[model samples]
Target: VNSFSGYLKLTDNVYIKNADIVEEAKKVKPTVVVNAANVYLKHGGGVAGALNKATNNAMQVESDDYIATNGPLKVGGSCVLSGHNLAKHCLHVVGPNVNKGEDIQLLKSAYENFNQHEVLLAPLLSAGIFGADPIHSLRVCVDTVRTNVYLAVFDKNLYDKLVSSFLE
Candidate 1:
C-alpha cells in the first residue's frame, strides 16, 4: 500500500504513478497499454518484460511472430498486440536508441504511434536501455500523450518529478 498514485488535470490531463506499468495498466483498464521496446521487440527486460511475464509469455510469442513476419521494427515504429490479460490491446513502440543521435523527434514519433484509443497506459519511452534522459522523455510524453493517458513510471525520482510537476 506504499505506491504513489496521482492524476494531473485533464486540465493538463497527464497521469503519473510510480509503479509497475502492467499492474497499473490492468487497474486502469485502458484501451491500450503502450511500452517502449527495443526495435527488435525482445521482451526480455524493461516494460516489455513486465507485460511478457504477466501474459504468461503469450505476448512474447506474438512479438516474436511479429518480428519474424515483418522483420525488426524500425525506430519510431509501433507494433500493436493483443493485451492477452491486461487491457484490451497493447502497443509496443520503438523509441530511437538515443545513443545513436539523441533523436527526440523519433521518440516523439514513437509516443504518437498509438491510434485514437480512448485511453492509454504507458511508460516513458527510451528512458531505460534505450538511453533517453527521463526528463526529456517526460516532455515528449507529456506533449504527445493524448487526453486520458496514464504514464506508469518505475523510477521513484521521475514519479516524484512528474507528480509534483503535473499533478500539482
Candidate 2:
C-alpha cells in the first residue's frame, strides 16, 4: 500500500540514495527486484518458487500478494510494478547467492521479459551494480540495452566477460 520511498525509508541504507535510484528507475523502465525485507522468512522457495513456477507458465497473473509476468524478455517473473507505476505488468527476479548456472537462468528469465515486451523497458542484473564501482557499467548496459559494452575500469586486470556479447 506504500510507495517506493515509503518502503526505502523503512529499510536500511544499502539500497542507495533514494533520489538517485528513483531517477534511474523512472528513466530506464528497468525491471527491479527490491529484495523485500520480510521475504527471508518464507524460505525453502515458498514465495520465490511459487513465483517462478507461476511466471513460467503464464505471461501475467495476480494473487492476493503478488503480480507475476512470464519470460523470454529482458526482465521477467512476478513483481509489483503495475501497482506502483500504473503499468500493465511488473518484472521481478530474486537474487539469492545463486550459482553461476542459476544466475544465468535468472538472467534468462529477465531477458525473456524484455524481448516479450519490446517496449522502451528492460531488466537489470542488480546483484553488484550499485555504488561507485565498475558494476555500474553493467547497470548502464542493462539500462541502455547496449548490446556490446566495455568496462571503463581503473584496474585493467579485473575485467572479464560478463555476458557472451561476442558474435559467437
Candidate 3:
C-alpha cells in the first residue's frame, strides 16, 4: 500500500487532488481506474477524453462495439476493461447529465455500484461536462464507497479551491 506525499484525505480510505491525474494514476497503479463515460462510451471529452488519449485510445476502441451493441448505457451501469494501457483494469461508468436533480442521485449510485478493489481511481463524476457541483460530486463519491479511493484531478488549484471551500 503506497501513498503519495501530498494527497488530501477526503474520508476514511478516500483521497483527492493531484496535479497530473494521468501521471499519478500510473505511479499508483491502482487495480481499477474509473472513467466518466457517456452511454455511448465515447471518451471524447473531459477526464474520460484525456484518459483515452493517455492510453492511446486502446480501451476506448476495445469498448466501442460492446457499447454500440448495448447502446445508451444508463447511469449507474458500468463495463470493465482489463489489461488496459492505463490501469490493470478500467471501469467505465455512465455518468449523469448536467443539471438533472435525479441524475445526481444516479451519479451517487454509479459510484456505489462499483465493485471494490484494493485501490481505485475515479474522476469527479458529473462535475465537468455533466454540470454538477464538483464538491457535491466529491461528497457523494466519498459517501458511497469504502474502497481505497483516489479522486484524480488534472487541475490542482481548482480541486484545492473546491475542496477547501467544501471542508469549511
Candidate 4:
C-alpha cells in the first residue's frame, strides 16, 4: 500500500480509498469535510453539486448566510457549514480556476485557513471535473494537508488497480 502512488503514502495517516464521497464523508466523520465550493456556494456543479444533493441542499442554505456576511470568497478563502447529513462541518473553499502548477500553494492555503482540527476529509483538489489529474492532486494534497487526510476516490475498482499496480 505504501509503495504505490508516489503522490500518496501508505504509512501516512492519509487515506485513498474507493467509496462514495457522501458515504465516505460520514464514515471518516472528520472534524470537517472540505468542499470545492464556488463563491456563491452554488452546489450546482461538480462535487459541490453532489454534496448539495446528499445534504438535501442544506449546505446551500447555510452557505447563503455565510456568504451574505462574508462577501465573495476568493481563492484560499473558505467558510464552514454545520454538517446536517454528513460530518460535523463542511469546509468550503474556492478552488483554482486553472492548473497553473501552483495548486500546491492554494491547497496549502486552504488547509491553513481552517481552524485547528484533528482530522480532515478532502477530495482530489481540482481533479475530476476541474481537470487536475488525480496523481498531481494527490501529491499536492499530501504535501499540504500532511496528516489525518482522507483522500476519497470514487472509482473503487480503478483506484484499487492503480494502488495494486503501483505496489507491484
Candidate 5:
C-alpha cells in the first residue's frame, strides 16, 4: 500500500521522469509548458507539433502573431502566450544547435528564461532535431530550471541513458 515514484530528483524541486511533456503539462497544469520551438516559432514537429495539435492549432496562431509583431525570437530566447486548452500559457523557446555552434550559455538561457513560473514542464531542449545529446540538454535543464520542474523524456531508451548516467 505504500508508494514509489520513478522521478530522478536532481534538486529539491527539479525532477526528471519518462513521460510525455504535453500530457504531463495538462496533468500538472503548470503555469507554462516549454515548447522547443525554432527561431521562426513554427510548431512543425516533435513536442511543438504535438502541443500545436493539443491546443487546436491556436498555439501556432499565437506564435505567428508573436513573430509578426516582434520578429523571430533569437536562439535561446523565449516568449509566453496562450496554452489554449493545455496549461495556463505556452512558453516557446528557441534552442541552440550544433550547426550554429552549440553554445552551452545559449542552451542554458532557454531553461533560465522560465518567466518565474512556480512549476514548469519542458522537454530536453536541443535533443531532438537540433542534434544535442540528452546529457548536454539535461545538464542545462537541470542546472538552469532550478524551480519546480518535470523534465519529460518521451523515449524509454533516452530515459534509460539518463538513469544509467545518474546511477553512476
Candidate 6:
C-alpha cells in the first residue's frame, strides 16, 4: 500500500473553465438552488422594450442582480442618463442615434439622475466607446456629471481624470 501510494498517479492539467451560469450552479453539488432570469436587448425588444420586459442581462457578472427590476421607460438613450429618466419621464437619448442637442439633453438628464441619487450605479459611462478615440469618447462621457464621481473603468489614465475633472 505504501509503495503504491508513492507510485505515479494518472492526472490531468487543471484549467480555468468558463460556464453558463446554469451549468455552474448545477455542478455546485447543492441539494437546492435558486435560478434567475437572463435579460437581453435583442430578445426583449431592443433598448426601448428592454425595460418593459424586465429580464436580467446575461453578460453582466454574477453580482449584478438588480437588472430588469423596473419596467422600461418610454424614452431610450444614454445609459447613465436614461436610467435616470426611466425613474421619471422615460426620456430616450442612448447615443450615436441621438443628435448632439438630444445627446446633451439626455446626458443632462442622466447627470441629474446622479445628482438626485448620488449612489446610482453608472454602467452607462462605459458605453461611450462607440467613438474611435478613447479620449474624445471618454470626455463626452465625463462631461455629463459634475460632482461626487464614482467612475469604474479598465483604463487607469481615464480613472485619474474622472477623479479630478480639471487637473489641480
RMSD to true structure for each model, in Å: 3.6, 12.6, 2.3, 5.3, 3.4, 16.4
Per-residue accuracy of model 2 over 43-152 as CA lDDT, tens digit each: 12433333334344232233323422232212224343441442234444343223333333343343333333333222223333311233443443345332221112
Q: Residue 75 error for model 3, in Å?
A: 1.4
lDDT (Cα, tens digit) per residue for candidate 6, span 1-168: 000111111112111112222232223322211111112222233333343333244323211332355433322222222222123212222333232223333334433434433222122321332222333433544565443332223344654553344233
Quote the lDDT for 96 in model 5: 86
Candidate 2 residue spans exceeding 4 A from truth: 1-21, 25-64, 67-76, 79-89, 99-103, 120-123, 129-168
Each prediction's TM-score versus the true structure: 0.84, 0.32, 0.87, 0.78, 0.89, 0.33
Which candidate should be chosen as best, given lDDT against the real structure?
A: 5
Clashes of 6: 13
lDDT of 1: 0.75
Measured by C-alpha RMSD in angstroms, how accurate is candidate 4? 5.3
The TM-score leader among the candidates is 5
TM-score of 2: 0.32
lDDT for residue 132 in candidate 5, whole number 0-100: 79
Off by over 4 Å in 1: 1-6, 100-102, 164-168
Residue-wise C-alpha lDDT for candidate 4, range 116-136, written one tens digit per residue: 555666666666666655565
Candidate 2 vs candidate 5: which has greater lDDT?
5
Q: Cα lDDT of model 6 overall?
A: 0.29
Question: What ranges in model 3 sit over 4 Å off?
Answer: 1-5, 99-102
Distance from true location, Cα of 35 in model 2, Å? 9.2
Task: Give each model's clash number.
Answer: 2, 11, 0, 0, 0, 13
lDDT of 2: 0.30
lDDT of each: 0.75, 0.30, 0.74, 0.67, 0.79, 0.29
